[PDB]
């Protein structure tokens, strides 16, 4: 099976709920493996404790900076960055899991979860997974965002790991 | 009641759009880099003896999907075109912003000021003459600034307001 990973989301430390993701290792194996390993922490670093620093309601929730903790940082399991693996999958609607980047071939650890169809990102951001359970938790996270993405409370990955 | 101007600060990633704006608004400079999605500021100023309210839109250096960029170009009255004197790509990007603004506004006569920022730094890659000649080709002023030392900061924004006022006379 494709891997399933989970995030336990917290709001100012209080548990909000669990979001689980299917990672499309069958189509995007290198990008899926990066996110999987960063979710388990097995390389000695990863998502646990990091925050969703940019939440834009009706657009997406972005997180994954566990090095600088401010939205500028990024570290993959392959180095600071890795190339865009492929653009097979598209941003088709809510729940799509895709890589944030600073341009072509700059994948690190930052990622975003779509809360709408975002077709203008197709071919620019590598889609590699989708929310499997807990989309209502992602929807609850949007209350803490704003038009420019600044969050009103600390939305964190309190725990994360691999289910299968 | 006083006149009010919608100003828009555009330019590539990291050229100092926010640092220029925060220096105008708050009179301080931060070395920290906090990338912008969109921020709005307001400030009451006196320019040439005329008191006015400036509505300043600080934009992202990275383009998203244009339809919302066309939005603030549609409503903006004057534009600061910012590059950094140590970032040649940011200077090369300038013509794209001017082209986009003229397209949305359907005019070759839109109030604009070319801003060469980071004029305190010793890593310069863009000659002043290059920027002066570019500004001449566009018929707009060129102002050299440093958000760090505050050099030219008021001048850049106030000159933009003067350009809007002059455009309104025609
Ligand atoms: S001009 C400074 C660019 C810095 C940068 O690219 N940082 C990236 C990052 O966060 N990329 C964003 C794209 C983006 C869009 C607008 C402004 C900036 O600064 C960055 C990204 O991948 N992303 C996911 C898709 C939505 C988009 C967004 O918020 O649009 C409004 N953010 C990090 C990864 C180093
Ligand atoms: N030395 C020097 N550094 C400057 C100057 N203006 C900005 N900087 C620095 O350059 C970096 C980027 O500044 P910032 O204002 O965030 O640039 P921006 O154009 O708003 N970036 P973005 O498009 O992501 O919003 C920061 O480290 C800031 O301190 C300047 O005049 N001199
Ligand atoms: Mg900025």
Residue of A128, A139, A137 lying closest to A97 (CA atoms): A128
Q: How many domains does chain A have?
A: 1
Chain-centroid distance of CA B129 in Å reads 19
| Min Cα separation A120/chain B (Å) | 6
A1-5: which pairs have CB atoms within 8 A and are 24 or more residues apart?
A1/A164, A2/A26, A2/A32, A3/A32, A3/A36, A3/A162, A3/A164, A4/A132, A4/A162, A4/A163, A4/A164, A5/A35, A5/A36, A5/A39, A5/A40, A5/A160, A5/A161, A5/A162, A5/A163
Contacts with A114 (C-beta within 8 Å, 6 or more apart), sequence order: A59, A60, A91, A93, A94, A95, A96, A97, A98
Residue of A138, A121, A164 lying closest to A55 (CA atoms): A138
Q: Which residue has the tokens 């494709």?
A: A2
SS (H, E, C) A105-145: CCECCCEEEECCCCHHHCCCCCEEEEEEECHHHHHHHHHHC
SS3 assignment, position A65: coil
Q: B71: number of CA atoms within 13 Å, CB side?
A: 10
Question: In the 8-state DSSP scheme, what is residue B27?
Answer: S
Q: Are A85 and A31 in contact (CB under 8 A)?
A: yes
Ligand 1 pocket, residue B64 CB under 6 Å = yes
| Domain ranges, residue A108 | 4-162
Pairing of strands A96-99, A111-114: antiparallel
Q: What is the CATH number that goes with domain B3-169?
A: 3.40.50.300
Residue of A38, A16, A147 lying closest to B71 (CA atoms): A147
A76-79: which pairs have CB atoms within 8 A and are 24 or more residues apart?
A76/A34, A76/A38, A76/A107, A76/A108, A76/A109, A77/A33, A77/A34, A77/A37, A77/A38, A77/A43, A78/A30, A78/A34
Q: Are B144 and B128 in contact (CB under 8 A)?
A: yes
Both tokens of B60, joined, read: 């992202």
How far is the C-alpha of B147 from the C-alpha of B29, rounded, in Å?
A: 7
How far is the C-alpha of B56 from the C-alpha of B79, rounded, in Å?
A: 10
Q: Where are the domains of chain B?
A: 3-169
Is the CB of A70 inside 8 Å of chain B's CB atoms? yes
SS3 assignment, position A58: coil
Q: Are A89 and A129 in contact (CB under 8 A)?
A: no
SS3 assignment, position B137: helix
Q: What resolution in angstroms does the PDB record give? A: 1.4
How far is the C-alpha of A139 from the C-alpha of A16, rounded, in Å?
A: 11
SS3 assignment, position B115: strand
Contact residues on chain A for B39, CB-CB shorter than 8 A: 148
Q: Are B152 and B128 in contact (CB under 8 A)?
A: no
Q: Cα separations (Å) of A72 from A44, A109, B113, B160, B170?
A: 20, 11, 30, 32, 45
The method of structure determination was X-ray
Residue of B163, B160, B165 lying closest to B145 (CA atoms): B160
Active site residues per annotation of A = 54, 59, 62, 101, 112, 121, 125
How remote is the CA of residue A84 from the centroid of ligand 1, in Å?
16
How far is the C-alpha of A42 from the C-alpha of A88, rounded, in Å?
A: 28
Q: Are B154 and B25 in contact (CB under 8 A)?
A: no
B65:A120 CB<8 A: yes
How far is the C-alpha of A111 from the C-alpha of A75, rounded, in Å?
A: 12
Domain with A21 in it: what CATH number? 2.40.100.10
Both tokens of B152, joined, read: 């030219």
Q: Probe ligand 2: pick from B11, B16, B94, B117, max atoms within 8 Å of CB?
A: B16
B47-51: which pairs have CB atoms within 8 A and are 24 or more residues apart?
B47/B158, B47/B161, B47/B162, B48/B162, B50/B3, B50/B165, B51/B2
Question: In the 8-state DSSP scheme, what is residue B162?
Answer: H
Is the CB of A1 inside 8 Å of chain B's CB atoms? no
Contact residues on chain B for A125, CB-CB shorter than 8 A: none
Q: Are B118 and B146 in contact (CB under 8 A)?
A: yes
Both tokens of A123, joined, read: 């071919």
């Amino acid at each position: 099976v494709n891997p399933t990973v989970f995030f336990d989301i917290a709001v100012d430390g209080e548990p909000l709920g669990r979001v689980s993701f299917e990672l499309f290792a069958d189509k995007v194996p290198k990008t899926a493996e990066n996110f999987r390993a960063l979710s388990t922490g097995e390389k000695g670093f990863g998502y646990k404790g990091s925050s969703f620093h940019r939440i834009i309601p009706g657009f997406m929730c972005q997180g994954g900076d566990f090095t600088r903790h401010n939205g500028t940082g990024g570290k993959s399991i392959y180095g600071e960055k890795f190339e865009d693996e492929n653009f097979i999958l598209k941003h088709t609607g809510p729940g799509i899991l895709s890589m944030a980047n600073a341009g072509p071939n700059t994948n690190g650890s930052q990622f975003f979860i779509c809360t709408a169809k975002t077709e203008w990102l197709d071919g620019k951001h590598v889609v590699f997974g989708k929310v499997k359970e807990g989309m209502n938790i992602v929807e609850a996270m949007e209350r803490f965002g704003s038009r420019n993405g600044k969050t009103s409370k600390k939305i964190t990955i309190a725990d994360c790991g691999q289910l299968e | 009641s006083m006149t009010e101007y919608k100003l828009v600060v555009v330019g590539a990633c990291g050229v100092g759009k926010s640092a220029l704006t925060i220096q105008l608004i708050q009179n301080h400079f931060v070395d920290e880099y906090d990338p912008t999605i969109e921020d709005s500021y307001r400030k009451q100023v006196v320019i040439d003896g005329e008191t006015s309210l400036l509505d300043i839109l600080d934009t992202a250096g990275q383009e998203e999907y244009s339809a919302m960029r066309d939005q603030y170009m549609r409503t903006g009255e004057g534009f600061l075109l910012v590059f950094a004197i140590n970032n040649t790509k940011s200077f090369e990007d300038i013509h794209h912003y001017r082209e986009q603004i003229k397209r949305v506004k359907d005019s070759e006569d839109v109030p604009m000021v070319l801003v060469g920022n980071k004029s305190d730094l010793p890593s310069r890659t863009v000659d002043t003459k290059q920027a002066q000649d570019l500004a001449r080709s566009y018929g707009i002023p060129f102002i050299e600034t440093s958000a760090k030392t505050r050099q030219g900061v008021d001048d850049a924004f106030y000159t933009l307001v003067r350009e809007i006022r002059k455009h309104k006379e025609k």
